[PDB]
Amino acid sequence: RFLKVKNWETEVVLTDTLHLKSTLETGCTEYICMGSIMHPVATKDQLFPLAKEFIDQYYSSIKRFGSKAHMERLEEVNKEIDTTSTYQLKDTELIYGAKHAWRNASRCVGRIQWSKLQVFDARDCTTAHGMFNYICNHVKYATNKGNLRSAITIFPQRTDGKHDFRVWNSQLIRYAGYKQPDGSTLGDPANVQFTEICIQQGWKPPRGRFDVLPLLLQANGNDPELFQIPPELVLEVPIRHPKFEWFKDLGLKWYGLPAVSNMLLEIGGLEFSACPFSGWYMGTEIGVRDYCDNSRYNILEEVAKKMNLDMRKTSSLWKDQALVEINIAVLYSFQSDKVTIVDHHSATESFIKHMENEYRCRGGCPADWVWIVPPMSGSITPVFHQEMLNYRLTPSFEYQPDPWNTHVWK
Amino acid sequence: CPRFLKVKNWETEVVLTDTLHLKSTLETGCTEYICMGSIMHPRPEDVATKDQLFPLAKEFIDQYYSSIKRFGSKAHMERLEEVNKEIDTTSTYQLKDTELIYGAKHAWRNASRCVGRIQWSKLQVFDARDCTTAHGMFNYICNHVKYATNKGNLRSAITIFPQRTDGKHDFRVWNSQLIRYAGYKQPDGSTLGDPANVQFTEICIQQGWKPPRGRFDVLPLLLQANGNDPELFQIPPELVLEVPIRHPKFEWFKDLGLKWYGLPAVSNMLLEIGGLEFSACPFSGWYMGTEIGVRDYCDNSRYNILEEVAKKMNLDMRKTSSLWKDQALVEINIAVLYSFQSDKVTIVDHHSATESFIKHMENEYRCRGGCPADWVWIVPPMSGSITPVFHQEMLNYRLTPSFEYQPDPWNTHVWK
Numbered sequence: 001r002f003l004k005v006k007n008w009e010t011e012v013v014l015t016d017t018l019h020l021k022s023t024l025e026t027g028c029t030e031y032i033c034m035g036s037i038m039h040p041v042a043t044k045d046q047l048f049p050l051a052k053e054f055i056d057q058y059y060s061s062i063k064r065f066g067s068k069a070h071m072e073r074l075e076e077v078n079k080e081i082d083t084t085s086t087y088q089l090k091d092t093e094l095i096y097g098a099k100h101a102w103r104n105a106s107r108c109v110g111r112i113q114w115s116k117l118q119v120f121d122a123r124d125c126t127t128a129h130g131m132f133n134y135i136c137n138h139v140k141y142a143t144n145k146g147n148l149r150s151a152i153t154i155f156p157q158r159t160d161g162k163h164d165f166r167v168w169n170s171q172l173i174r175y176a177g178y179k180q181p182d183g184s185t186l187g188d189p190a191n192v193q194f195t196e197i198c199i200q201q202g203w204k205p206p207r208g209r210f211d212v213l214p215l216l217l218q219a220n221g222n223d224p225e226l227f228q229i230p231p232e233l234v235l236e237v238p239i240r241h242p243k244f245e246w247f248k249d250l251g252l253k254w255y256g257l258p259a260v261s262n263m264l265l266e267i268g269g270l271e272f273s274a275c276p277f278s279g280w281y282m283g284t285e286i287g288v289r290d291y292c293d294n295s296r297y298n299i300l301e302e303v304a305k306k307m308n309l310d311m312r313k314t315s316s317l318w319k320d321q322a323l324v325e326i327n328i329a330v331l332y333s334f335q336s337d338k339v340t341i342v343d344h345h346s347a348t349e350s351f352i353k354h355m356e357n358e359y360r361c362r363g364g365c366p367a368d369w370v371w372i373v374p375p376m377s378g379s380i381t382p383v384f385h386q387e388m389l390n391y392r393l394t395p396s397f398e399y400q401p402d403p404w405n406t407h408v409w410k
Numbered sequence: 411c412p413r414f415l416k417v418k419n420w421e422t423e424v425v426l427t428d429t430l431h432l433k434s435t436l437e438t439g440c441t442e443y444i445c446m447g448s449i450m451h452p453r454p455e456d457v458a459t460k461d462q463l464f465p466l467a468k469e470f471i472d473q474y475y476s477s478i479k480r481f482g483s484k485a486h487m488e489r490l491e492e493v494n495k496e497i498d499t500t501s502t503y504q505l506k507d508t509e510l511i512y513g514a515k516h517a518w519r520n521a522s523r524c525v526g527r528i529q530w531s532k533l534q535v536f537d538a539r540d541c542t543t544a545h546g547m548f549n550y551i552c553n554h555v556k557y558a559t560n561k562g563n564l565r566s567a568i569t570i571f572p573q574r575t576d577g578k579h580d581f582r583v584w585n586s587q588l589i590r591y592a593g594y595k596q597p598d599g600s601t602l603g604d605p606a607n608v609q610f611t612e613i614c615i616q617q618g619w620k621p622p623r624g625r626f627d628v629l630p631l632l633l634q635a636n637g638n639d640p641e642l643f644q645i646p647p648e649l650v651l652e653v654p655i656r657h658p659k660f661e662w663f664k665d666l667g668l669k670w671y672g673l674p675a676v677s678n679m680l681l682e683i684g685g686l687e688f689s690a691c692p693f694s695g696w697y698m699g700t701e702i703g704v705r706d707y708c709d710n711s712r713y714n715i716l717e718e719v720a721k722k723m724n725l726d727m728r729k730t731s732s733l734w735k736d737q738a739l740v741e742i743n744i745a746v747l748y749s750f751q752s753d754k755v756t757i758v759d760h761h762s763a764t765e766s767f768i769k770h771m772e773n774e775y776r777c778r779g780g781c782p783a784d785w786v787w788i789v790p791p792m793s794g795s796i797t798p799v800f801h802q803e804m805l806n807y808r809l810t811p812s813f814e815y816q817p818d819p820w821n822t823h824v825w826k
């Protein structure tokens with residue numbers, strides 16, 4: 001059945017037919033909704049239908065369904081799954097599949113940009129040194145002196161599960177976290193475990209507050225190897241406030257390039273376990289989550305201190321006042337340094353426009369309200385009042401286990 | 411369905427185990443392949459047949475005697491048999507007072523979207539099932555308002571009018587809340603008062619209400635008894651507690667002339683107990699500040715005062731990345747909380763309410779085996795991630811007794 005989604009602010013109603021094309025499961029049932037649950041080695045047998053599905057949708061996309069090339073590709077992929085237990089995507093298919101994995105990412109508010117993705121084919125990589133080279137080129141290309149450009153670098157696909165390529169880092173650029181003897185945490189608390197794994201692997205921590213972690217790179221299932229990103233490649237922004245001259249005295253900074261490196265890219269039944277992809281930041285991703293979460297930098301109290309706010313009772317909303325000011329500073333700093341960044345009002349406004357486009361030309365847009373709504377000022381953004389339908393299309397980005405839980409060392 | 415389901419809090423690492431989901435009775439609207447969790451809502455002749463009513467009544471009666479640790483008792487088997495005979499001879503049955511009170515408290519306890527359920531067992535239940543006329547409904551509602559208001563020391567309460575019979579004799583409160591402000595659509599397209607209430611205001615004016623046409627005109631009650639045409643009543647103004655909104659720092663804030671009413675009393679929902687349908691069941695608690703300060707004031711299709719407040723704050727309103735909207739939203743919510751606390755009218759900030767809900771949820775998981783919760787509604791409309799419910803996974807499911815949506819009565823009513 002067709003399904004309608006209403007925006008309760010504009011009263012626009014859109015009709016979803018695209019959900020009818022999905023086959024993966026969401027985790028909900030008719031009686032239980034798991035919409036706020038964060039996470040609810042193929043064979044030739046399972047592989048060909050997935051490949052056939054994806055080839056069919058590719059040749060449908062380029063308006064050549066049932067063509068000579070289409071019939072030939074199908075048979076070409078048929079004989080190759082038979083005789084090799086897998087197949088290899090054409091370059092065109094790889095690009096199409098990566099763009100559509102972004103397009104199908106129900107949790108991403110930045111998808112208005114989806115077809116503007118620079119795809120780096122790294123399927124000929126064999127060693128971690130090679131991965132490091134490919135990754136530096138990604139970081140340099142995507143950073144582009146502050147005029148950030150979305151990119152993805154795709155390493156060789158999984159074969160037997162024993163030879164995976166993995167980026168052990170959760171992002172390419174992240175700050176170290178140090179669990180202090182006195183209990184607390186220096187640096188970034190999100191990364192305490194990974195930082196310890198890098199130290200145990202030989203990394204010599206500077207033990208500052210903003211130490212860029214090394215790359216820890218696993219090629220073809222071998223042990224991971226440490227690499228330092230050349231510092232001239234790592235663009236950073238000192239956070240200052242446009243009114244509070246004392247803000248810069250907090251000593252804060254962040255990196256310009258958000259580049260997620262621990263997810264899995266699935267295309268036509270093939271699994272790409274190393275596929276770092278980058279875009280540019282929405283300001284709340286730094287100023288709200290990375291700075292004010294209890295298990296992150298947790299700087300809310302100091303800012304409210306310097307603002308001389310009454311912090312005795314929660315109903316003074318001192319946390320809310322300090323949160324807005326931190327986010328003002330983040331946007332101001334990136335914009336003053338001409339580093340690409342988007343505020344949650346512009347981003348969500350763009351996403352509503354993106355939804356309109358997708359419903360017109362595609363029949364729907366899978367979208368995860370729980371993730372699309374920004375972590376502050378929810379209802380004064382247009383996505384808050386936008387009903388969304390969440391469903392799982394492929395190609396897709398998926399979660400995968402942390403490598404240090406599966407990898408057999410030597 | 412799997413027997414145990416785990417939810418995790420990603421801030422504290424606490425993992426909880428849900429078994430209560432196995433008792434879920436109605437559909438969420440999700441399927442295996444689609445999630446409808448952000449859809450807001452996923453005939454008058456049709457009432458429960460005898461065959462439909464039997465299992466629904468037995469399920470609730472069982473649950474009630476289980477709750478009072480008398481399951482399988484003589485009194486339990488007797489009640490079952492008495493209910494069954496009533497349904498056989500009369501096609502319906504009547505709840506005992508004890509069962510009515512238990513059902514109403516559990517409809518609140520089961521309300522997945524309510525952040526305030528830590529209070530669920532402290533609900534004053536007024537049995538208005540002897541009511542016959544809209545004048546009688548007005549009396550019951552005035553008494554409700556006065557008790558729940560309690561001079562600003564608000565107390566949660568529900569008033570339950572007679573259940574549905576054949577569907578042609580419904581009791582209904584046409585108001586969406588007992589106390590709301592009129593909205594008037596002007597000829598020039600602008601709105602005076604509360605734009606959320608323009609349609610209902612028009613209905614009241616058509617029914618004979620003489621509007622004052624101000625910004626904050628308490629709407630009259632429009633009350634339907636026993637399926638008759640609804641009738642208008644003015645709530646005595648001494649019973650409508652109101653708070654003028656001022657700001658602890660901004661002296662000019664009072665010059666906005668804003669005020670709000672103290673008692674949030676939702677009156678358009680349906681209470682379902684044991685297959686019985688109580689189409690008129692106004693219930694009230696007290697406000698979370700953001701229900702006024704974020705939604706009621708700063709929604710675009712509401713009072714929409716963000717801009718005016720930002721002007722008086724001398725913010726740059728040309729670029730969105732100055733976050734002038736966010737800065738103004740906070741100040742408005744500071745004022746709402748400060749004005750209610752100053753006048754000693756119960757109110758709860760979103761930090762306190764969500765922390766209590768977390769403690770509540772944990773207790774329910776411990777003592778009950780779960781707690782249905784709708785994250786999309788539990789997370790407050792501002793500052794979501796700096797409240798503890800943001801990082802708390804939740805399972806949503808529909809238990810009974812429950813509060814249900816129902817069509818607006820002007821759309822179904824058969825005018826006499």
Ligand code: HEM
Pocket residue numbers: 098102105107108109110111113117150151152277278279280281282285342347371397
């Ligand atoms: C171009 C600018 C982009 C912006 C502003 C943006 C914004 C965001 C934000 C705010 C989130 C939520 C993150 C969080 O709160 O933790 C998100 C999630 C996500 N983004 Fe985007 N994004 C961008 C580009 C991209 C690109 C280039 C890709 C891949 C090619 C991508 C794939 C994803 C995925 C897969 C998720 C959700 C991951 C999951 O399912 O857990 N995004 N994005």
Ligand code: HEM
Pocket residue numbers: 514517518521523524525526527529533566567568693694695696697698701758763787813
């Ligand atoms: C005592 C203080 C209470 C507080 C602080 C509170 C808080 C809230 C809030 C913030 C919402 C979301 C409203 C919105 O965003 O529009 C809500 C919804 C709701 N509350 Fe509570 N509430 C309270 C009392 C009660 C009582 C006494 C009942 C019933 C006996 C109740 C039943 C409900 C229901 C049924 C809904 C959502 C209905 C729906 O749309 O599905 N609440 N509550």
Ligand SMILES: Cc1cc(N)nc2cc(-c3ccc(OCC4CC4)c(CN)c3)ccc12
Pocket residue numbers: 038258259260277278279280281282285
């Ligand atoms: C390309 C891109 C740009 C951007 N501007 N933002 C992005 C955020 C995520 C993302 C995905 C999952 C995720 O985490 C899931 C759960 C917290 C563990 C997080 C949290 N860092 C971020 C992924 C990609 C992003």
Ligand SMILES: Cc1cc(N)nc2cc(-c3ccc(OCC4CC4)c(CN)c3)ccc12
Pocket residue numbers: 450674675676693694695696697698701
């Ligand atoms: C007792 C009580 C106290 C309170 N403090 N708050 C409450 C809010 C609602 C409630 C329920 C549904 C609903 O909306 C239905 C659909 C969105 C239109 C609204 C919107 N007014 C409020 C109901 C009861 C409440």
Ligand SMILES: C[C@H](O)[C@H](O)[C@H]1CNc2nc(N)[nH]c(=O)c2N1
Pocket residue numbers: 008384385386387388447448449450786787788789
């Ligand atoms: C589209 C979306 O479901 C709708 O705006 C919901 C979202 N969450 C909400 N949450 C609360 N508490 N109250 C609301 O009215 C809404 N509205």
Ligand SMILES: C[C@H](O)[C@H](O)[C@H]1CNc2nc(N)[nH]c(=O)c2N1
Pocket residue numbers: 036037038370371372373374375420800801802803804
């Ligand atoms: C429990 C909850 O699902 C979890 O904390 C989610 C909620 N929504 C989110 N939304 C975004 N954009 N980013 C997040 O990390 C989260 N966290």
Ligand SMILES: [Zn+2]
Pocket residue numbers: 028032033034035440444445446447
């Ligand atoms: Zn769902």
